[PDB]
């Protein structure tokens, strides 16, 4: 896994003519149904890995939508820009998910925040719609996915599956994100 | 009257101002403009917590009407005085005598039970309640407990 | 200025700036993702020590793994250090190098040396970093500084 | 400043023609306006009147005076919405689409209030969305579909024929309480008349154009007998390309 | 005070903000209130 | 990237100085081990080192909980079988399939009930592993010497009562008949240890 | 001597947070960029002017559970126990009153009966009506309103 470097004309030519890799992987898997080949678990693995290339990015976003009580109003340009920037920094590996999340909750919102929160929330849990429309919006306006819908679908799906789980929206602090020991 | 623009109901605003400006960063007047401005917009300018019923007002609209009938455009205090004198003589049935909500001056105790208890420290309670002071019609021979 | 602007010029890509000014562009595997196009600088490499640890994979199987400690530095104010346990010598070298780029630290050189004594202990190793008229230190510590 | 100016009034230039008296009267009105704004803010229910896509501060051209339209918008309709809100809260219908209120209260008494109100709200909405202020010329594809059905051997005869049939259907509704629609059955066009408290969605048609045949609609202007003139004008002011794109979406 | 008395009739009480802000329509409200369960605490360096 | 942050190319990534000196620990534990099975120090399930832990001592009783396969185990139908046994023992003239039908109806349900419980319990094993278990990371609480500090606190007390003197000392045991076999002048009851 | 199995890889239960804390990366990246020899990542270009919150500290360094560390993640009932008793009791006497505003999801831009009724409860109390009577009176108010409504419905 040595990431190539950008180089002189041939590498840029090869960036240009590149085309869609996600569709190519799929073609190459499917083509195992051709009479002269078999159906390959490796071709499928490569398919899978290109479908899930972002993956964990979505995962991160889930946490920002569902794992935070009262993350302010998520429509306002301010908190929105916080979210945007941190997302673009989870993608492209500039930050750890843990660091980006701890950034997000500790980001600056508004003076006397709790005391303004007493004017809206009882037990301090806001409504989650603004959060999801925001977190889909970011992935759309950031160029995160090749095909537009995938952002919204994945983010939605991953939430709906967790909805059925015992104590769904809380997480152990150590297993929630990247740490030395992890879950299977 | 637009004397001032800013109003708040938040407890101990002073602390919050302090610690908000602690998290704030640069000194360039753009940064300053925004930080101050954001503070103002979020607390001191009235949106979503507010109502006209709820702000404290002496001149609430009938009072305004009365005032401008009394003191508006009168070129001395004497004019004002015979104007008033002429107004206090109006009956209760006249069209031009208008009522209004009057703000009740609050009592000390606030309830009658409080009145009794307050009264009762200037007094000597009886060892026995009134219904049993008077002896039984039967005779209760007192033993040791 | 706590959080200085730094280098903003976008007229080339990060990868082209990096390519031109840094030797690091030649070794894209030795650098972690967050630092990839980010350096404008040349880094010296210093391999402090090589060593051999046995690694038992089973009660029969025994492998010979080696152990590298090195530190990357550039006299321009940026260093970092790393160590690794790998199968080959080349492996532990490359490993420890991308480990040392993960841990990179910087120093503000406005002051050219610490202005107060820093007393701090690494595990079991008690270290004193204090202001001097010049650089005094053990040879190795000296050119780490 | 837009937020601070009350709902009705316009923000304009000082000509300094103001005596002090009316200058004070204005501030009084503004004070009361703030008061009634504060109470309307809490009286707000789930459903709400639609924002109008076109300025009605003057009338809707060739059709309505300011007062006619505004007597629809800010009197009858706003009322219908009050009722709808009052009866969709405290019931299983709280906080669903306009639809699933229209659709699950259909065809029955004892929800009759809710259904009437809901379908009314819709009819009005779709009515406003059906009027384009200076009127449009009906687009080629819709003209073609309409020709295949109504057209008898004449050029775009379908248009005068449809705008005739609508008049006919309107006059054939005696109550003067209700709605005339141009709708798509899913296999063909036709012009229907719905009584007050019924909508094309309850009958599962797909609506293209709405016309308001309530007497309240034409009474301030065309009088009691003026319905023909009214409809004729509505076609000067109606919105065709809407009906068209809805039609094409229905088809696929 | 001997005489503020004239002032006292058109005098103004101070408005009820505490319960007004209590009774503001809230977006966390619940038909029946439930108290949160108890949160995880820090039991010391060995326990986490 | 493609996989975990705490596991590199060759095995677990060695952060503390214990791993640079003892790098067996990087890749080995137990028999159940795979290369993806590092960083998850728990291995698969039904597998060697799959067991979840609770305050460090692993959980090996799971079935015993839901009352499948336990000596104390949950019993579905009793009244049935006792009724049928009663009938069987009473007499041989009349025969009852009237009871046996009730009973095997009962069992017929019991099957799906059990599959249900087993299923739910596996869900519990998973939930537990996510949100409770420490994965054998924290010190045992379940043996008395692990609580030594606690006991010490009480030894301290019994000492300060003794004028801050005899630590861990206790009253000398006496005799079965201690009180009633001893003449005047000798202690008939065991004293505080400082009071010897 | 037997130990718990994974103690070799056991994380430091006090300090394992430090590494990831936002301020840390702010400072480090701060003096890294300062060199001139590093290209700032864009997150730093951003949080440069909105540095994170000051006084949120973890529960590891501060040993208190009661400390509400986070302005964001906080949960404390704004409801004082008296209020709890009151609106809870109101809602147990009638489910219609409880359900009204929120049947499915909370519709939060509409006024709700539970609140209105609490308001006129206190209203009654300060006119000296006692507890029980005020409660049955407010409830009667709601019920007679509802009576009007469903009479119209039938008509
Ligand atoms: Mg073992
Ligand atoms: Mg031993
Ligand atoms: Mg062992």
Automatic annotation (TrEMBL), chain C:
<protein>
    <recommendedName>
        <fullName>Small ribosomal subunit protein uS5 C-terminal domain-containing protein</fullName>
    </recommendedName>
</protein>
Automatic annotation (TrEMBL), chain D:
<dbReference type="InterPro" id="IPR019832">
    <property type="entry name" value="Mn/Fe_SOD_C"/>
</dbReference>
<dbReference type="GO" id="GO:0046872">
    <property type="term" value="F:metal ion binding"/>
</dbReference>
<feature type="domain" description="Manganese/iron superoxide dismutase C-terminal">
    <location>
        <begin position="169"/>
        <end position="244"/>
    </location>
</feature>
<dbReference type="Pfam" id="PF02777">
    <property type="entry name" value="Sod_Fe_C"/>
</dbReference>
<dbReference type="GO" id="GO:0005739">
    <property type="term" value="C:mitochondrion"/>
</dbReference>
<keyword id="KW-0560">Oxidoreductase</keyword>
<dbReference type="InterPro" id="IPR036314">
    <property type="entry name" value="SOD_C_sf"/>
</dbReference>
<dbReference type="GO" id="GO:0020023">
    <property type="term" value="C:kinetoplast"/>
</dbReference>
<dbReference type="InterPro" id="IPR036324">
    <property type="entry name" value="Mn/Fe_SOD_N_sf"/>
</dbReference>
<protein>
    <submittedName>
        <fullName>Superoxide dismutase, putative</fullName>
        <ecNumber>1.15.1.1</ecNumber>
    </submittedName>
</protein>
<dbReference type="GO" id="GO:0004784">
    <property type="term" value="F:superoxide dismutase activity"/>
</dbReference>
From TrEMBL, chain E:
<protein>
    <recommendedName>
        <fullName>Mitochondrial ribosomal protein S18</fullName>
    </recommendedName>
</protein>
TrEMBL record, chain G:
<protein>
    <submittedName>
        <fullName>Uncharacterized protein</fullName>
    </submittedName>
</protein>
